[PDB]
Each structure stands twice: as structure tokens, then as C-alpha cells.
RNA sequence: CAAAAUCGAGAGGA
């Protein structure tokens, strides 16, 4: 505790039933800071808080705080022999003192969570698999991934036009820098059964909000190429080819290229065009086209073309293309409580259900997603967010915090001329008449996950095939086929449909004839 | 025919022919960027 | 509390005792009866069968 | 990266109220007070101003490509 | 020619677990970029729209088209041979709504009725007589559903909340609560409709219509129910809010008092066992009898609190609205969202002593209380204190791993059985035989 | 079997919004007026951009999109112009469109704010709104020392059913039966509910007694504008547009019946 | 060399310098560059010795 | 990729007729008008006006699919009338109501603005 | 001297902010590499 | 070879893409985007009909 | 057994009260609805059962 | 075998309870809690 | 007139 010869990270156990003392200095042990407790009192007095509060003048950092015997690193094995107060209230002499010989305290309980689970607001009102899915979907949510993205040739990148910090935000988010590189937008969500297109984890977006920039994105994709002079036998080179000299030229025109053989920034490339005209000298003469095409049906704009020399010293190139992604039917959107779902339909502003001041929603989600999942944090977030946006704050959703509960949010909400529990009367946008029920509506933070339908639609009708067994290739990239596996074959045998089965497994895949001797039966 | 680039570091135009090693002639910097084209793309402000 | 018709359960039991001894649903019992080589090679253990 | 021209929900122009909102803020008005100064009534428009994260200022640190 | 409207396509979702996982649909060409499906047909495919995907095949012949049209079409598959009950029934918003449409006091105007009758395909054309002609012409919801019901079918069911003693005393045939559905000459004489009446049970209206009428009549029956009821729910609306998750102060006090009682009894049991005053039951040691008694105490406490919560709710509560209709969720969800989350078991036992005789370092050693071993005495609306958060995480992890490790073995079993039985088939002799042509069953299924 | 006789009583008028009330008419008609205010009133708005140069930190599509959503003044011109589909001229011409320009370069070490004040229009009747003679201008982009933006864009006539940038309003607020007399909403607890601004009830009483006979009359409108059109102009253009839609439909109907 | 570590050129630089090097002030470091790809060494568990 | 152009919602494709009248063999004196490139805005007003007539036995309308741009109106009148007549009279009375309303709004504006 | 229950809820967050200013989030990677280079190579 | 290329195999004339609700289709209809249909074909035999 | 009991001569006079036309229709109905329940040969009951 | 895939009591404060990949690596990949700090190693000479 | 490899590792989606 004095920072004496024993460094801070030295675990020190004392088995007591058996009579051993064990001291560890090895590497790899995990540990966490705790507060040290006197008889029944913290050693952290307000002297220390006063000196830290001006941490930027006194340079009274955290190091001076461990150095003064106030916090202590206690690791997984020395924890077997401490008695932790959860909070300095456990210290208070209770009517029936629970333990009354505490050794340490937690600094705060909410620091038992990670970097993606620390985004979830009110995680302690959610059922646990909800929190785990959100942890896993917060890593797929398009935002701003880095401040200097304008100079990076990442292979793929997604950047969100208008990211917004949450109106309801845990205090741990301060230190994850989530307030400076945020990954989503605040929406006015309504929980309603409305026209039937938001059933089964699907949502109804608004087309007018989407024509004003809502959840729009840009998608960047970079293409490498290098001219290999590996041998005088065959060497590549950048050069605008011609219809006469190359052999392996597709019908795609080569006009967009420049004299050096590289398309210039600001050219609207379409799908199946040429971005690098690379011709390898042959042993349609003395050179074969080896041009680089785009990934099919992408239709971006050339963003920039960097040229440079690699390690060994040939020409190197990186072309970056930029495709803008407006949200549309089939795009996956999710909230911070494991509530994922594709978009089912879009309505214009005048077909959405509005309020007595014409606040139409941005998103409408089904009331059936709630009861099976038990994500109450979603509803408290909507309620707290409404209060916050009417009050001009940013609410506090930190998990274990007795100062905030539903009754207080509701009382706060009643004072801004609202029903306390968040309900409103909406009118039907198609026909104008009130809706007999009151719809629950408020501001919620959504994310836009990387899974867009334009990267998943596929279709094959007699394209290329594999070289060994003349069956279709696999993948959208290869213009591939879809596998008619063994379970489907069993299903169609149950169906009794033998002609369709023959057609799938013979005629659609690999037809072929062979001539066979009638005597030995070995292929003549 | 000229194919001007931009020296990635000193932001200096410099004109380089084919089969010529990429090397800036103000500061020796090895990375250079093509310039914006002259064709006309229309955008719908939509 | 689930329910499955009886025809299917009876068919499975009768397939599985139709030869007089207990037949296991495995490569030891299914693949050792007289199904002819090609079906056997389809199910499991192709090389040995052929 | 930069203050949206229109409120997404209602379509009210909040493009011309960002620098003003900041100036109000450094005049020691609260967020609520500044927002009632500018005439944003609905919590949608206030959501738009109060949740902005101005990143363009960062991007004006990196020096341009073409000097 | 390019694929056009009305072509027959087979439609598949993987894993392909039964013959309803491939079915023949008719094409309908639409603007955007997804395969739009109907909703009733998400039970056979076992689908939902949280990013699922599905394949589409296109038969390339008149042979294959005719075969698919005559064998694999979606109408033809409504009743399944596995368990001889319909395989697709009504689902979420349609189910909640139709439970509401059919309550005894849903009266429709004139303009509203004509709206709703615009979405009946199988409408003869003639507006029926209202149930009330003076002071105002008002139709009711049974009176419109009676137009949806096909043919002249006859059916009897009983709503889920039917007080079972009711059929004993008087009032058997005028239900005070409007349960005891009775369709009779294809006209809903009385009763509320729910899962038990339109779901995939056996003997439901969907099933009886299938057996009695064609399968085109039933196809239209599904479609009409869905469209009419969605276009009423535009008028009626459905939500779930916070206001549904709250209970009044009185019931909160009941719940807290029950919990206090239960914890006190568990303390009593513990100190008995500490005084050697507890004696084992037959077939169980002292540890096991002790644990069984404590678990029984706490389970009874959870049940009592759940009942108190369920009873506290008013009849506008939307949780209860989606529970009674069968649409989504069950009463344990209401208990946990309102009353108390209960005990978290990890492999069927309370939380284990992973530290040295401690579940965590916040408790003293040899602590067998309810809090120490993982009893969550909070609702999902009151929050969870940090230790309950950790124990709840442990329980959820058990569930996740289970879902993620069962699947391989079951898949193997499915494959193995298929290859075992595949070639048995019913012959023109009416016998059942295998490929080798030996008898397996002299008659199918005896 | 004959039309209504509505009456209009106007409660407020500014350059920001009109607060009026119709009375003695159908709900369908009232809500169709509401739908027309949003989606079928035409205004001017940039919808053709051509970036001749851009060094700024935002890509080109971003700038185009962010230019379309600047309101222009469509006060008296939009009736005179033609839809470009309807104009027989080429791509552009003074009957169908209006040309804008923007050329801005930064030289000082302190960030230049491009705004809608630097859009110079060809036609003097059509201009950005904040520019019109307080509220500052719509910040389009910021240019540090070195960047430069130069473009040339065209403004055309459309309506909000095509794209949300041609929607002239900024929120129609609509209401009827402010006290729940018709029981078109069933409050499970009518006392928790705040009273309406239009409601006429003593504070003890929560909702009005049920009135079996009445149906909606007296709809309360509150139309707020974005700046393209002054509000009363929005409403007058809306009534004209709905009436003209019905006139065209009736002409087509006469044609069809004549054919039959 | 792991980035931002004591033998990286960005060690001890102030934010203004990082921006003037086209390096993000916020990027935390802790990875390697091998042929211009970013690699991260994932921590491995093992039994105590 | 499969995004229809935004002007499909209201611009008539070439050869498509605005309105298209049918009979209805279900019952006598019924018709089915199909109107192209329209939506609830005109459907609801026409329908509500029809229900004011006492010689209209059944009026309703439906939008078959949100993602195509037509409505269908079904009107059934008494035997001494004719649903085409009823439709025309409804549109006539809607136009008169709108004209009167526009005039009265102009007068009210003149007043309030004049103070 | 003692932190009363009403100041605790920001005492703890001053402390945690000081911690994360001292260390960072990815300190463990960087520190392990510094160890390796400083000592284990030698 | 056997289970990978005789019992199951890749097949022509087949699309994949995401499913989305649609209440307005009958139970035996499916919605197909325009591009999928534009891509896949069907050999219709010419007759005087 | 089931048919012979439910379709009795006493039940049919005290419970159901059918008439002669009704009985003839009922008999035709039972015959058809029975004859449509029989397995169709060529049915693959093995894959169905599995 | 699911025994090594379960959340152990001993992860309190060290490893995060909620964040795991829910596929086939479930419970086998883990993220450090926020303040958890992994020691780097020292020399046992001065203590001894 | 069809142009565009294979093998291992990892991360994901339902
Ligand atoms: Mg799914
Ligand atoms: Zn240079
Ligand atoms: Zn707004
Ligand atoms: Zn023109």
C-alpha cells in the first residue's frame, strides 16, 4: 500500500484453514481496482475527491491515488479471501448488520460490463439473451468508424451521413468515446399494429423522413492492382488497351480509361465496367487483356486513385469507389435491446398516423416483439427519452442506479403536458379518424446494421459452371448456383414428386450422354 | 497526354510519363493521387 | 404433451424388427442388410462398401 | 457530420440554427433555455439539435489533398 | 420468356425439416428487392423477418409444373399427416385483433361495414340486416365474421378463459362471459375466437373447413380473415406501453408481503437444519431434502406472486390482450414483467459455490439464503441489483449454450432415420414393401 | 344528396403559420385537405446539380442532397412555371426551370462557412428563403484554407408526393372533437389525460358526456410553413389543387361513359 | 512494432501532431501493420504454471 | 436496384386510362370503377360524398396493394338510378363544396389580415 | 471528510474518470509489448 | 463425390433473397422482385394457340 | 364398432331424430368420406414416417 | 462439452458476462470488463 | 464470341 518494494500488481493470498501463504508476481494474472475499507469506513475521504476534481492543475492523477493507499488491485485469487461491500451503504450499521467486517468496496457495480455491453441503457430491465444479442449487433452498426477515414484504403467501409449521440446514455459511454464517433440516429418510434406490414420482427419506416437524409449511408470499396514484371517471359503493364491487340477482352467498352490506363476520379462507373486496363504480354497479339472490372452491378463513382511503388518497386494502384445507400425495403435495423428486424414497407408522411400536433413517427414496430422477449429497457428508454427531449438533457441509463425509476420519469413527464405513461392519441393518416386505442410513442435510438438486401439478392439461370464436374459455381461473386442438398431430396421423395426431382438433380445441373457397349457395359 | 498527379505530401502538381518511377520532384514522396476528371456527372439533389 | 400419429411410429418399429433380430439404425445394422451396393454407399462408409 | 437541413420528422429547417444554438450555449443558457429561445417547440426538432455531434470540425484538421 | 405473373415456383427454407418446408406458390411480380410472403405461411417454413432468407426454384417443363401444381401447392398441404391437424393457422396481429373483433360488444356503423365488406373476395353481394335497427343501424363483429366463414360448417369450441365450472350450473347456453364458441350453419352464433378456435389445434374452424369444404374454399377463408381483420385494426389499433407493465400500489404491497413471508420461512428451515432438527425423507439425503424443501418454498412464493399480478390487471391491459388471444407470450411473462423474476437454476440446481463456499465475494461463507444462491426478488420493471444481474446472466448462458449444442446430434438422427426408411412405399397390392420387395406391413398402419 | 356549406373562422395569421378552423363538413373532406397540404402543393426546389469542383470534406452526392433541401421562394412563380415534363423546350429553359450558381474558395486561416447566401440565382423572384429580407442562412459546408467548391444547379417545380423536398409545410396539426364526446377514443382512465388547448370543460370533468347522435364537425387546423409559401397561400393552393384533381377525374369519367 | 507503443513514432505526440500526420487522435493503437493490413494478437488462456 | 421511379405514383403510363368502368354480376345496379394513379386522398372523399345520397345502397373503395397505384370503387344504387349518375353527382357536389369553401377562406383572410 | 451518501454518486465517477485518463482502454496490449521489448529480448 | 455431387448439387434456375411480410397476397402467392423475374426464364413451346 | 353403435336404432330415434331422406344422404356421405381416406399406392410412407 | 462454456462465478469483475459470440464459439470467447487490468510481470527477488 | 484459379485460416448471417 505504500508502493514500497512490493509493486502494486503483486497478488498475496493467505489460505487459513490450511496453513499456507502464497505470493505471485508472474505475468498473465487479471486484476481490478477496489476501494480499501477501514474498520467500517472507506479510506477515500473528500480530500481526495477535492484534489482529483482539479486533476488538470494539481496533476493529482490516478497514480497518486493508488500511491496513497486508497485503491488496491485485487485479483481473481485474492478475491477468495476478501469481503466486498457492493456500495458504501453496506458499510452502514444496519438493524441486522449483514457481515460488519468488510474489507473492500466496489468503485461502481456497472464496471463489470464490457465495451459493447456498456452501450445498452437500462441493461438491468432486460432479459439476458437480449443483452447478449445487442452486444453482438453493436459490432455491425454503421457509424463513423474513424476520424481520418478520408485517407484510408480499407477494402470495405460504411459511413453514416448524420450520426447522433443517444439522448439516453450510460455514463460508461463517456470513456468509450461514443459521444464523438456515434453509430446511429434517434428516431421517433411508435409501437402499433398498423396495416400489417410490421409483423414478425419487421418495421415500417417513413419515406419522407428517408428523403430528408434519415439513415442514409455511403459505402466505399477499394480495388488493388500491381503490374508484375516477374519475368521477361510475361510482364503486365498499365496501358489503355485496344480492340485490335488484346485477346481476352469482354464486350465491355474501355473508353473510360485514361492514357495511363487508370480511370480518373469523378467518373460514374456502372456495374461490369473496367477500372484498370492491365495487359500482360503474350508469348489480339503479343498481349492479353487482364483488366480489372468492378464487382458486378455496383454502380459507384470513382472516389480517388492513388498510385505508388510497392516494396519491390513496381507500380501499385488503389482505386476507391463510392456507392450511396439509401434505406429501403429489406434493410436490417436494430435497437440497443436486441430488437432486430428488417424494413417491411415505407409510407409517405401523409399516410402515417399523426398526433394532435402533427408528429408522425419515423419507425413503427410491432407490439408483439415485447412480451415474448421481455425487453422492458426499450420502453423505459422511450419514456426517459421523451422526458429528456422535452427537458433539454441527456438522461442517465446507467444500470444499477437507485435514483431513477419509472415513477420518477412518469412524474417528470406529466409536467410537460403529457400523459404520464407515454401514451398519446394518434389519428389514422389514411382516413383521419382517431384510433380507438392510445399509441405509445417516444424517441428511441436505432442503429443500421451492415446487412442490406442489395448484397443478398441473387439469381441464376444457366451461367458458368465448375471445371471438374460441370455443375454451377458457388457464390454470388462467381454467379454461382444454389445447392439442392440432401434434405431437400428427402423432402421431395416424401412429396412423391419424382419428375421434379429428376429435373432438379439431373437436367438443371449436369446433363450428359455416354455410349456403352451392350456386352461388357464399359463405356465404348 | 500529360497525366498530372499530386504529390501526396507537398501537394505539388507534377507531370509523369509512363514507365517512369513514381517519385516527387520537390520532396521525394512516393505516393501520388490522380486529379479530378473533367467529364460531367449530373446529380439529382434527391 | 406433443402428438405424432401412430402410422409413423408403427412403421418405424416394424422396419426395425422385420428381419427377426433387432436392427440398429446405424451403419452396423442398416448398412449390413441386403440393400444392394449403391444405396449402401450413399448412406455411409462408401469406400468399403464399393 | 454536419447539422441536417431539415428536421427528419416534421421537416422544419434547423440548418440555420446550429451556430446560433452554440452561441446561446456559451452565453450560459441551459439547453432547455437556448432551445426555447430559437423556437423549437416539438421534441422532434429539439431531438435534432440536442443530439447533434459536429464531426466536420475534426475533418477540418487534416490538410487538404490539393493545395 | 422471362418469368411472368402466375408461374409455379417451389419455395424453400433451410433446414428442410419436413415436407411443408418446400411448397408451390404462384408468382406475383412486385417493385422492391425482397421476396414478399404472406403471414399464415410462416409457421410451415418456420420463418420470421429478422433477416431470414429463402430460395426459389422454377420448374422448367409442363410435366414439372403440372406435378407441382397438383401435389405441392400451399392449399393442398394445410392439414399435415404427421399429427392430422392443420399446419398453418392464424398468427400475431390477426389473432389478437380477431379476438377483439368478436367480443360481445363490438358494434359497427354502416360506412365501416361497407369498408370491411370491400375486402371480402367471396362476398355474395348483399348487405345483411343489422343486429340493431333502432335507434341506429349497427352491425356487430360476429355478424361480419359469419360472412367470412365458408360453406355451412358446424363447430363447437371453448375460449381459453372459459370458467370451466360454467358448463355445470345454469347458463350453460347463454354464457355470461361469451365463451363457448358455437358456429352453426356457417354463422358465428356466439363466442370469442382465439388460438383454440383458429390456431393449428385439431377440430378448429380451419380444420373443419378443410375437411368439409375443398381446399380452395379454405384458401379463401385464410385470405379473407387476414384482410378483413387488418383493415379493421386500422380503426381499432393495438399497442403495448409502460402503462401495461405497471400495477397499483395495493398489489405491489401484496407481492412484497408474499416475498417477505417466503424468505422468512427459508430462514426458519435453514436454522432448523443448523440445529439438527431436520430429518431426511425416504430416498433422499439431508442435503437433498433440505434443497428440495427450500426450492418448494420459493416456487410456491413465485406462483402466488404471479397470480396476484395476473389478477391485478384491468381488462384494457395489452399484455393480457396478447396472452388470452394466444398471439404471443404466456402468464409467466406477465409474472416476471410485473411481479418477480424468481429463481435462477444452473443445471437444475441453484447457483453453485464457485468461490470457496461462496457464490460471490459479497456474501459470507456457508450462506444458503435465497439471495445468496440466486433468487431474483425483482420484476423486470423494478430493475435487478448487481448480483441478480450476474446470476441471471449465468442462467441465460445455460440457455444459449443449450440452443447452440443440441442441434448437431438431432441433425444426425434425422439423417440416419431417413436413410434407414426411405424406400418403403405403399404398393398397388395395397401392401407396404421396401426396395428389396419384402413385406413390411400387410396394410398401411394396420 | 347535395354538398355541404362549410364555414371558415380564422384564429391567427403570421408569416410562420395560420391557425384556422373549418366547420360543418365531412371528416373525409377535412382529412383530404390535410393530405393535400402535405403531398400535393407545388413549390420550387433544386433537383439538378453539376459539381464542377469540390475539395471540401463532404463527397459530391452529400452536397447535392443537402442543396435540394434548401427552401426557395415559390410564392408567385410556381403557378407560372411548367413541369419540365410539360414543357416542350429542351432539358432546361426559363419556363420550366431556374438556374443557380455557386463558386466559393477559401483563403483565410479561419474556416469559411458556405451558406445559402452564396447561392446566386438567375431569376430574382426565386431565391433561398433566409436570404429574403433574425435567422441566419442554411450552412451547407465549411471550407478550411485551401478547399474550393464550384457548381451550377437548376430548380424545378414538383410536389411532395414525388419527394419530401417539395413538401411546402413543416407540420399540419389537426384535431376534432377535443373533448371525447363521440367516444372515438376509449380512455381506460380518463383522468390521467391532459386537457386539450381547444377543450371547453371545467377542470373537474375529464371528458364530455356521450352524444349518440353527433358526428364530427369543427375540425381545428394549424398549418405551419417552412418558408417557400406563406401559409394562407399554401391553403389556397391546396383547395385549388384538390378541386382541379376532381375536375380532371370528372372529365375522364365523361369520356368513359360516352364511350360506353 | 505495435502502434502507439514506446518504440512507435507516434509515441508521445500531441493531438495536433497526429492530425498533421493524418493519424487519428482517437485510434487507440495496440496492433501491428504487416503488409499494410492491421493485425491484432488475441489473448490466449492457459493453465497456471 | 429495383427501386421504381418516384413519378410512377401519379404519372399515367402510356395507354393506361384514368378511369375504367365495369359491371358487377353479383347484384343488379352495381359497378366497379377502377381509377389509375390515385390513392386514399380522392377515394375517401368520393366515398363519403356518395354515402350522403339516399339512392346509393352500397359505396366503398379499396386500395388493392399499397405498392401499386390504383383504387377500386364499388357503388350500388336503387333500380331507378344508375351508379354512373351517382358518381358524377358526387364529384359535382364535391367541387361545389370546395369552391364555396375557397371563397369563404379568402374572405376570412381578407378580414383577419386587414384587422 | 467522509463522503456523504449524496456526494457518493459523483465521487465514484470522478474516480473512474481519473482512472480512464491515466490508463486508457487498450493499456494491456501496449504494456505487454513494452515488457517484451524492454526485457524479454535481452 | 457422392454426398456432395450426386445426392445434392448446385442447380440452375434458382434465386435467393430476403423475405418480408405482405398481408395482401393470398396464401398461395409469393412476391418476386422485377430483377429476379427479368433474369429467370422458361421455355414455352410455340403453337398456333 | 363405432359406426354400428353411434348409428344405432335407438339413438337414432331418441337423440338425432333423422328422417328417411336424411338417413339416405348420411349413408352416402359416410361411404364417400371413408373411400377418400385410403392410402394412395405409390405413396412414400417411409420418408413420411422418418 | 458445455462445462468450459459456462459463465463461472469467478468472472465477476474480470470478464464481461453478457458479451459473447452466440454461434459455435459461445462461451469460449470473452471480453475484459472495463477496469480489469492484466498484470505484466515482475521479478520475485526483492520480495524474497 | 463466352470471359473470372485452387487449397488453408478467420470472422459473420439465419
Ligand atoms: Mg429469422
Ligand atoms: Zn512533393
Ligand atoms: Zn421536427
Ligand atoms: Zn421548359
Short mmCIF file of N, CA, C and O and ligand atoms in Angstrom, two decimals, chain B residues 6-14 23-32, ligand 2:
data_model
loop_
_atom_site.label_atom_id
_atom_site.label_comp_id
_atom_site.label_asym_id
_atom_site.label_seq_id
_atom_site.Cartn_x
_atom_site.Cartn_y
_atom_site.Cartn_z
N UNK B 6 -0.69 14.52 -58.06
CA UNK B 6 -0.50 15.38 -56.90
C UNK B 6 0.41 14.68 -55.93
O UNK B 6 0.10 13.59 -55.45
N UNK B 7 1.54 15.31 -55.63
CA UNK B 7 2.44 14.77 -54.63
C UNK B 7 1.70 14.67 -53.31
O UNK B 7 1.25 15.68 -52.76
N UNK B 8 1.58 13.45 -52.81
CA UNK B 8 0.74 13.20 -51.65
C UNK B 8 1.13 14.02 -50.45
O UNK B 8 0.26 14.34 -49.63
N UNK B 9 2.40 14.38 -50.32
CA UNK B 9 2.88 15.13 -49.16
C UNK B 9 2.89 16.64 -49.40
O UNK B 9 2.23 17.39 -48.68
N UNK B 10 3.64 17.09 -50.40
CA UNK B 10 3.79 18.52 -50.64
C UNK B 10 2.68 19.09 -51.51
O UNK B 10 2.70 20.29 -51.81
N UNK B 11 1.71 18.27 -51.92
CA UNK B 11 0.54 18.74 -52.65
C UNK B 11 0.93 19.53 -53.89
O UNK B 11 0.27 20.50 -54.26
N UNK B 12 2.00 19.10 -54.55
CA UNK B 12 2.52 19.77 -55.73
C UNK B 12 2.16 18.98 -56.98
O UNK B 12 2.44 17.79 -57.07
N UNK B 13 1.57 19.67 -57.94
CA UNK B 13 1.35 19.06 -59.24
C UNK B 13 2.69 18.61 -59.79
O UNK B 13 3.70 19.30 -59.62
N UNK B 14 2.72 17.46 -60.43
CA UNK B 14 3.89 17.15 -61.22
C UNK B 14 3.54 16.11 -62.25
O UNK B 14 2.77 15.19 -61.98
N UNK B 23 8.04 9.29 -58.09
CA UNK B 23 8.88 9.93 -57.09
C UNK B 23 8.67 11.42 -57.21
O UNK B 23 8.84 11.97 -58.30
N UNK B 24 8.29 12.07 -56.12
CA UNK B 24 8.05 13.50 -56.19
C UNK B 24 9.35 14.24 -56.36
O UNK B 24 10.37 13.90 -55.75
N UNK B 25 9.31 15.27 -57.19
CA UNK B 25 10.46 16.08 -57.51
C UNK B 25 10.44 17.42 -56.79
O UNK B 25 10.99 18.40 -57.30
N UNK B 26 9.80 17.48 -55.63
CA UNK B 26 10.01 18.55 -54.66
C UNK B 26 10.53 17.95 -53.36
O UNK B 26 11.41 18.52 -52.73
N UNK B 27 9.97 16.80 -52.97
CA UNK B 27 10.23 16.22 -51.66
C UNK B 27 10.48 14.72 -51.68
O UNK B 27 10.62 14.13 -50.61
N UNK B 28 10.53 14.10 -52.84
CA UNK B 28 10.85 12.69 -52.90
C UNK B 28 9.76 11.77 -52.42
O UNK B 28 10.00 10.57 -52.28
N UNK B 29 8.56 12.28 -52.17
CA UNK B 29 7.49 11.45 -51.65
C UNK B 29 6.99 10.48 -52.72
O UNK B 29 6.92 10.81 -53.90
N UNK B 30 6.64 9.28 -52.28
CA UNK B 30 6.40 8.16 -53.18
C UNK B 30 4.94 7.93 -53.52
O UNK B 30 4.66 7.11 -54.40
N UNK B 31 4.01 8.60 -52.86
CA UNK B 31 2.58 8.38 -53.06
C UNK B 31 2.01 9.59 -53.77
O UNK B 31 2.29 10.72 -53.39
N UNK B 32 1.21 9.35 -54.79
CA UNK B 32 0.63 10.42 -55.58
C UNK B 32 -0.78 10.06 -55.98
O UNK B 32 -1.13 8.89 -56.09
ZN1 LIG N 2 6.44 16.67 -53.17
#
